């Protein structure tokens, strides 16, 4: 897509995770976990839901048309009738075509995005505190438990508590 | 001292493919099918108020053909004519059939109303051994053959006034004779004509003599016509010989009344949308059952797929 | 020691819904409407040069109707018919009236040019109490009706060449008596015909005798047809009876021309787009007044409207 | 959008502000301010009338056509002329309506776009000098008077000239 | 101590301006042109049969005009008719000429099977100075003159049955004399009459007489007439004068054939797309050349030319 | 663009460079260079021909149909012909401005974010090791030579081989 993120930086998905769409996973000093994150989930299935509403909505009714089978040869209003029905049925088909194309390629697009809008929410609540491997995680330099991890996931992360820890492993160590 | 922290989305072991701007199949997590391609086989008897014609066509159960006469005064949301419907009575033609097929289907009842006609100086209701009503010859119901009367066959004159709010439809028809000598045995004159007319229309045909295939027995013929008399206005019918009278008319409606050729079952069950093939649930906006629907329809086109993408690209796990 | 700089963009107190791919409604800064749905209720007479027929159709207009003589070689880009036109002349049908009609709308005039035809050994200018003109009797000024001239009808035989670099329009019609006693008594013939032809083209009318409904105080009719005759061509009228002779022809244009129904008043103003309910502006690139159009005009769509966002997102402020 | 910035990280607009659509905010030591930059507010502008000239472009003339109304029941010719202009309504109606769909879409994330371009050019500007709230807001770690910011919102911004100043108080006050 | 690694794209020093949803024009590097605008100006006879009409219509083939006589039992895909065909036999008219035309060049050939029709009582093979065939008079080859045989004209009354399991065409006809004289003189009869039937349809013709203007030396007139048989029906003629016979029948094909107006030469080429000005190549999505067209072509639109970017925006360098 | 990356942050295009799409232009001890990179270069060609295919791919055979000039005025059925075909030829020219349009839009956006792609990739590898310019540029703080460089082309740059270098290039020299 054109953020990059899914099938991007984002090698590849998790197999498994049921409980949303878009998630974490975490290696601490208490072991490893997973977790979804429900707010991008639901804002990449709403737009979805919404594109789909919008197409599968209000069928028009049609009752005496024209016939469009015919036993016997006639000639110029037989032929009418048929070129009228064959040129209708061409615009539909191009216009079924034509939408099914947008609408994937938008919907690839958007939940590529909202990929991206959860990293880079990630990335601004961790400030100095951590720093980007280039694979869609985060080396957080300072010792992170499963409640300071859950805060990060819950948003309610106070990078101040972590800074000069975290500054002094990343800048330092070794120079 | 650190902890690592990924994110990441979700991956299915089997995704869809599907079509894109840049990509002809392109994996999903998930997709959606938007062309309906599939029928029941059976048409539902609900919503639309279905009448089957069983073996005859909405013009012989308008005419009167003596096996159609069940469908007197039937009223319908779509007649179903039936591949095996067939005509048994005076063989006839409808110069213009698929107008008056056609207007007839979509006004949507077959409601006559008898009329007082007086045909003064002609023997009426002939009948043919062609059209049988029973155990003797018969004609078409809502017809009145007229042969003459003695040595003469006068030059019938008879009005018909619209009073009422409603525009009628008048059936009639024209008799074309084998042989001259058939011509003045019923009508006299060696010539007939029908004028029908109303005071903005006015219709004349004469009869065409000659012989034409055997068609139950007979080599003459009928040709069958329309005048629809809108409220305030007055038929007329003029005729010196081979009038084949109407006996009243036909109520006309406006609504959403159609004919379709299928020879699919009727159901009990409910659907919106009815084809040819039978009945197709209309939750999608598209499909490719048949190009001839009637209803609250998906759209046809040419496609038997198209999937919509409901999910993200499908990108799974490594292995290992 | 430090400083905070914030990036932002505007809001609005109350913003405009739009639909989207996603969305149903969502709020946005600004809309613009893009379906154009009022009318003025009157029809601007620039910069279409625009005819009302009044109570003349272009037909009675065409044929000369007494009342409609003011039209004599009109011309227009737009005639309107009135719903309170009238016939007021001799009882008459034309069989294809849609087709005289639209391409004598699309011609867009009714220039008439008188030719010197011979009709040797009959009476001419016949006229009717049916088709008074001023205080007695008249007839469609464009038609000659032809009448025996004592004690015979002749085979009329006549010829016009089209001498000319354009195509020329001749209107033509034939009687149809309602007893063979006015047959007679006009035609001397106990059977009329009228053949018209060019050399590509031939057309063979007999008339219909018999009564129909009283118009005007009569029960016979006159039938209306037309021979369009190219540059190069001839026209042959060939008659024993029952001729409504041409009396010249109607010049034929190509363009931009054509007629409309409706009711709607003429006023001066200028406006580029048509609709019988009213002239309409073309600013936007729907609308939904009517299907019916005449020049520049929107697009006819079922909607009501369409707003296209000239804003970004509306997301307005907290409040304290 | 597909961006995120505006309805995202941005948290709601400013009412008010008559200037320009995108701008900044700030408060340093002689005080707060607002001011419109009017450069992206016109590249904004400039797209959305690109887009509405296409569109209320060029009603094409028609003259004379076929009838649309009857008087009299006729039957096959009249239903043929009937279902040619019924089958034309309902093409350009579905026509009109993708279009606005299509368009308004485009238009929020092509706003959200300028409105994030903005934000990473000012990012760029300030290099090591500030570090990001995570709300649309910098903390210029530096003494910024009111020529300091309008030489951030006019592009002349140096960093060289606070970088010293900046990276002490960033990487340092407690460690 | 330090390095820069700068990221970029490349431009090229000459771009193409293409529209975009903001854009009318904007400088990409590439684009490509997606609306054939040129032909050839030539035919190609492949891949599709293309028979060259000449100097004849498919009209003039069918019936057998003689200078059309090479045509004979020809078939096509693609029928060509040129601007400089003409008729050089009796000068006739076909009422519903286009569906005539329609349904033989959609059936494709001009196959005929003679048949062993009897015309008992009547002189067979007329002919005319108008339609020369060599030397002297000749007719229609597909078509037989009968007039009276010494001092009657019999009832023709002939039947030919479709035991075939295919539709037959078959071409008839009726004269309409100039005077009554030549009526009675040809078919003694004062007025004649022509019913051609099957099972299910009917037609009766009846001649008109009347000068027309003078074609080939002659002022009377042949029209023609049409009946497709189906398997299983029966072929019927009836006619006491006037009669145009038919000589056989012409097989029925359904297919991808059809008739085109072009002057254009055929060239020896390979060409899937044919449009009356020539042929023109597919590898594009759309067309300007003609609305008109044959076979796998591009769909025709009013732009001449729509550009696809197919590279990136154009940012040109500096310049120093 | 969207992405605000060609035509943006990046001035102006390179001319000459015939070898890919997307490239690099660097400047280190051993002086400068240029170079394409492959991999985003064969991304934003493989989605044009993809899109390109789908375009000029398969055009409709119709065979007979419905006579579209007259030589004689008829009326009626010749105006319901013409209707017809006009309506028709509307529709279809409507359709290929839209995809023409729409096409286009998307094209440059598309292009502009395989830029911006390539952009943070390049980014990411360099770590606490470079700076950014605001201008597509990076300031890599350690001396980088060809090899160097073309292991950040080639994607095996080792940010920690020169991490205490540049940190001490950055943070320091002056403060
Ligand atoms: C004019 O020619 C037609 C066509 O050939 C003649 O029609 C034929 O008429 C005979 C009776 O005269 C029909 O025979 C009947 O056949 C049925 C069915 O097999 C049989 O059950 C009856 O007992 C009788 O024999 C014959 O079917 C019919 N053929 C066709 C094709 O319609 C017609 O008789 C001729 N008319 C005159 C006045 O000469
Ligand atoms: C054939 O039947 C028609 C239809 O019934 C007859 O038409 C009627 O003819 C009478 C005159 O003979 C018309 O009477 C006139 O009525 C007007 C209007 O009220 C009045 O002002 C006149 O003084 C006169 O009385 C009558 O209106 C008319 N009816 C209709 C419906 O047209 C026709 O006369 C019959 N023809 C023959 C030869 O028997
Ligand atoms: C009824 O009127 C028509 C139309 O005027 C008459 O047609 C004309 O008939 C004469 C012969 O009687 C034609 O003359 C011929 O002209 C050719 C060509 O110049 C010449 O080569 C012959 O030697 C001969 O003179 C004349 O062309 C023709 N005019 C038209 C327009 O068709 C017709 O004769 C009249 N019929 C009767 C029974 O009065
Ligand atoms: C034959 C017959 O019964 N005719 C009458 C009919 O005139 C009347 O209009 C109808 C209404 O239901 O009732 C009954
Ligand atoms: C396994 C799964 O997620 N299935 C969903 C299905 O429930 C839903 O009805 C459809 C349309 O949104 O998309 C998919
Ligand atoms: C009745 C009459 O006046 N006729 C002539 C007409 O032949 C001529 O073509 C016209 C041109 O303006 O001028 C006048
Ligand atoms: C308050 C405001 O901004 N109104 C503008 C209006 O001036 C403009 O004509 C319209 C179309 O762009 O969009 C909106
Ligand atoms: C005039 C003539 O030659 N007719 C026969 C024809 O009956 C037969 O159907 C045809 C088939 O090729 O062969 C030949
Ligand atoms: C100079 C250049 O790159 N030309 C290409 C051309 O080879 C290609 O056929 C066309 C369609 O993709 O686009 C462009
Ligand atoms: C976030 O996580 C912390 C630590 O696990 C927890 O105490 C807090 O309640 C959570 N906050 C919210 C809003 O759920
Ligand atoms: C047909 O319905 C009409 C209207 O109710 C009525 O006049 C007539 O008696 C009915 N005839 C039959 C056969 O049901
Ligand atoms: C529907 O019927 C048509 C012909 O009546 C047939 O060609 C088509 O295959 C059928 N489709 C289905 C889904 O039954
Ligand atoms: C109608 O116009 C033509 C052409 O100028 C002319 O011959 C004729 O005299 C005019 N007649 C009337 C009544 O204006
Ligand atoms: C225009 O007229 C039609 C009928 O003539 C009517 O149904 C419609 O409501 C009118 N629309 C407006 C905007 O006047
Ligand atoms: C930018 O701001 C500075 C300080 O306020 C001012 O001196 C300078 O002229 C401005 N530059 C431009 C290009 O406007
Ligand atoms: C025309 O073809 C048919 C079928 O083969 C055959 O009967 C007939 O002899 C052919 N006639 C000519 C003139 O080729
Ligand atoms: C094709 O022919 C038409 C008329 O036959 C003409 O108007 C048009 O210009 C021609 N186009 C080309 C490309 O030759
Ligand atoms: C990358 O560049 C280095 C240094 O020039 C080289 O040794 C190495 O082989 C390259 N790696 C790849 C995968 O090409």
Known sequence: GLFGAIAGFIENGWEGMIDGWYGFRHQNSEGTGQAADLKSTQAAIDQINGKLNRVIEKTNEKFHQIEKEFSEVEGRIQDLEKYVEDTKI?????????????????????????????????????????????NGCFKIYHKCDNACIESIRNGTYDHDVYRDEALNNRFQIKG | STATLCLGHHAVPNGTLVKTITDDQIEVTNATELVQSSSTGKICNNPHRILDGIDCTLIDALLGDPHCDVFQNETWDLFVERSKAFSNCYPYDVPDYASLRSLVASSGTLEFITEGFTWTGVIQNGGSNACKRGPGSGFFSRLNWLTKSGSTYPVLNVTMPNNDNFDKLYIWGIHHPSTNQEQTSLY??????????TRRSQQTIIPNIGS?????????????????????????????????APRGYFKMRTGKSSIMRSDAPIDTCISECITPNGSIPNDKPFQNVNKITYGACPKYVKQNTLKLATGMRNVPEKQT
């Not at chain 1, 609408?103 to 590529?112: G, R």
């Not at chain 2, 006299?188 to 007319?197: K, Y």
């Open chain 1, 90 to 134: 061409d615009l539909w088909s191009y216009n079924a075509e034509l939408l099914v194309a947008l609408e994937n390629q938008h919907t690839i697009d958007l939940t590529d995005s909202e990929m991206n809008k959860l990293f880079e929410k990630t990335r601004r609540q961790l400030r100095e505190n951590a720093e980007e491997m280039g």
């Open chain 2, 212 to 244: 034409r295939p055997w068609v139950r027995g007979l080599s003459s013929r009928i040709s069958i016509y329309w005048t629809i008399v809108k409220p305030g206005d007055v038929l007329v019918i003029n005729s010196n010989g081979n009038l084949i």
């Open chain 2, 188 to 197: 006299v004159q060696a010539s007939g004509r029908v004028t029908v007319s």
